[PDB]
Design a binder for these strands. Structure first.
Lengths: 94, 180, 166, 52
RNA sequence: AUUGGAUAUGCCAUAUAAAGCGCUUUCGAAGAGUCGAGUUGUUUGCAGCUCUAAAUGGGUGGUCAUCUAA
RNA sequence: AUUUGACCUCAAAUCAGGUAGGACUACGCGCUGAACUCAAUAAGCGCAGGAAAAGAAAAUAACCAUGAUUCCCUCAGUAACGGUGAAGCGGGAAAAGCUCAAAUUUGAAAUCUGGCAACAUUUCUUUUGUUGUCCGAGUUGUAAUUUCAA
């Protein structure tokens, strides 16, 4: 509204669409690096605590599985990031 | 530990000689580069205009000069700054345009003005940028006639409403999401 | 390029293959000396991305230091003192065990002509880079002294500036 | 003795300009010149003006 | 007697090349015992140790904004 | 049997050519560190230069947005902490940007140190190179192209 106070506070000008900055991209999953990550995955295996999570999930005790995963990593977002990845591996193995 | 300033006139003289030596060394070109017009990033100083570090890639491309040759002819380039409004865009664009219009480029190898150069270059003279490109301030509004709908418009009554809307924005934000 | 595969494998340090290799290698370095020459780096991908080229002038030394200050910084300082004609370029962790951490330090011979004629490494020949590992100008050195960019990272206070006119 | 004794002293610009203006006005008065000690007994005119 | 940089002038070079700019019918690789968490120590920052990551992910500031570490 | 040749590892040489030490320390970067906030001080230890360090945002901000580092005025004795004590913004001094790893040159290692022989060039018979030839390094990756601004 061209106003100093409000949810759209500030001046009103003609807004310009900024060109895409390449450093914003990092974190993207290229097909080639995804393929290489697949190869190392099938050639290296999984860490010992991953194997315990497989056993925990195959036993269907998900609460303890996420609790110990958070204890191993340190953050809930990392624990969730693990869980979806190893369950995703689970149906692939099945 | 004390820091005394008995070398203040000495420092001032040394800086002036360094400027003088710089001018003598690179006399054909101005001793200060072109700088873009840039607005300070705060509510206390957003009403002013000062000299930024350098132009952006979008401004350089819109003006028609490439980012590679821009450094060579003396146009500093900032790769971090971005233009979020056309008002700043054509503002810096017209700064470059007037710079280029007043700019003369000596041909290299002194054989012919290959594409972008100057045919006659005997009129060389060292002049500061500020004279040709005097950075200005925000345009001060001149007198305008009385607006009738603005006259009916109260003023801070609105600022009270959008304020109350802002403070209790989460209050109704909850209200809709919980009832929906 | 295989270095992508080498890098991605180095990520998973708890893998069965990595665990077996680390134990065998760490055992081998044990009856090797505390500091010993390594003719070829054990992690070529890490060495290349840290600045090591397979040309005459680059030197790889392996050092073991006991655990229990920064071990990486201490490793660089000891190797730099042990090879006094070399500038410490960088270093990287290779192996660890219960008590010994193993590091490989990349060094450059400033007197070699293959280094002095290379414009991409010529900066290290300048005398301002003598004993960077001791002055704290390496990667781990900078991180240990807290050099960084941001609000997170003395003499301006302990002085009272008295101007001419006041 | 220390070097950061207050050697220099700040004077208001208007006070400095006041003093200089009074000094010029004083220089334009014959009697003040005699008290100053200048031997201007046979000076043709005060203030003294000479061509370019 | 040296030089530092330019101007005029002469001789070699070899361009079958290299580079900048507008489009994409395209893909865009980006740093690991590192980040991070718990604990002890030093004046958020750093270090020791247990444990140990991710790829629109990670860091920082109050879903958004800004950066792209090792 | 065993002889012959490779590669890997490790030695020895008064082998050919180089390099490190020690001194100065006012300023600079680290480690360490008391006592009477003292003080991240003094002492001790390591390491450089003509400056050192820092430096081209894993930065500020919440703005119409700023835009590498360093220094000065201001912020400000404010925020913050329990006497200590900033920083953003703003005004100046000075300004300059970049380089790798991560992708096949695969129709060609195109790369490089050293030995030998000439040609040179010099602050200089004292310096620094060029070409040719040989050996070696190197495919466990040297060259060219790319560094996210892309």
């Amino acid at each position: 509204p061209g106003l100093v106070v409000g949810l759209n506070k500030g001046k009103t000008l003609t807004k310009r669409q900024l060109p895409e900055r390449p450093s914003r991209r990092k974190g993207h999953l290229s097909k080639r690096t995804a393929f290489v990550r697949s190869i190392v995955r099938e050639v290296a295996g999984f860490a010992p605590y991953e194997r315990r999570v497989m056993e925990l999930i195959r036993n269907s005790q998900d609460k303890r599985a996420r609790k110990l995963a958070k204890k191993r990593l340190g953050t809930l977002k990392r624990a969730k990031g693990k869980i979806e990845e190893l369950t995703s591996v689970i149906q692939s193995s099945r | 530990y004390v820091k005394t300033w008995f070398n203040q006139p000495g420092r001032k003289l040394r800086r002036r000689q360094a400027r003088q030596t710089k001018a003598a060394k690179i006399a054909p070109r101005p001793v200060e580069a072109i700088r873009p017009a840039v607005k300070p990033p705060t509510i206390r100083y957003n009403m002013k205009v000062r000299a930024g570090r350098g132009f952006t890639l979008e401004e350089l491309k819109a003006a028609g000069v490439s980012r590679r040759v821009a450094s060579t002819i003396g146009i500093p380039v900032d790769h971090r700054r971005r233009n979020r409004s056309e008002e700043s865009l054509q503002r810096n664009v017209e700064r470059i345009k007037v710079y280029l219009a007043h700019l003369i480029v000596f041909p290299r190898k002194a054989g012919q003005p290959k594409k972008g150069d100057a045919t006659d270059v005997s009129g060389a003279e060292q002049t500061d940028v500020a004279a040709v490109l005097p950075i200005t301030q925000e345009a001060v509004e001149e007198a305008k006639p009385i607006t009738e709908e603005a006259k009916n418009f109260n003023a801070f009554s609105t600022l009270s409403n959008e304020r109350a809307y802002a403070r209790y924005a989460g209050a109704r934000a909850a209200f809709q999401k919980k009832r929906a | 390029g295989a270095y992508k595969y080498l890098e991605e494998l180095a990520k998973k340090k708890q893998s069965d293959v990595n665990l077996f290799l680390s134990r065998v290698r760490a055992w081998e370095y044990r009856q090797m000396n505390v500091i010993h020459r390594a003719s070829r780096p054990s992690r070529p991908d890490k060495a290349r991305r840290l600045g090591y080229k397979a040309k005459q002038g680059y030197v790889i030394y392996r050092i073991r230091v006991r655990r229990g200050r920064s071990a990486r910084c201490t490793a660089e300082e000891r190797v730099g003192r042990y090879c006094s004609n070399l500038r410490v370029l960088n270093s990287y962790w290779v192996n660890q065990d219960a008590t010994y951490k193993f590091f490989e330090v990349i060094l450059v011979d400033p007197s070699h002509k293959a280094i002095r004629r290379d414009p991409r490494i010529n900066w290290i020949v300048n005398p301002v880079h003598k004993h960077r590992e001791s002055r704290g100008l390496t990667s781990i050195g900078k991180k240990s002294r807290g050099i960084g960019k941001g609000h997170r990272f003395w003499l301006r206070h302990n002085t009272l500036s008295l101007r001419r006119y006041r | 003795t220390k070097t950061w004794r207050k050697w220099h002293v700040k004077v208001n610009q208007n006070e400095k300009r006041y003093a200089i203006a009074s000094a010029v006005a004083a220089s334009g008065v014959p009697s003040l010149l005699l008290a100053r000690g200048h031997r201007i007994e046979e000076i043709p005119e005060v203030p003294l003006v000479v061509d370019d």
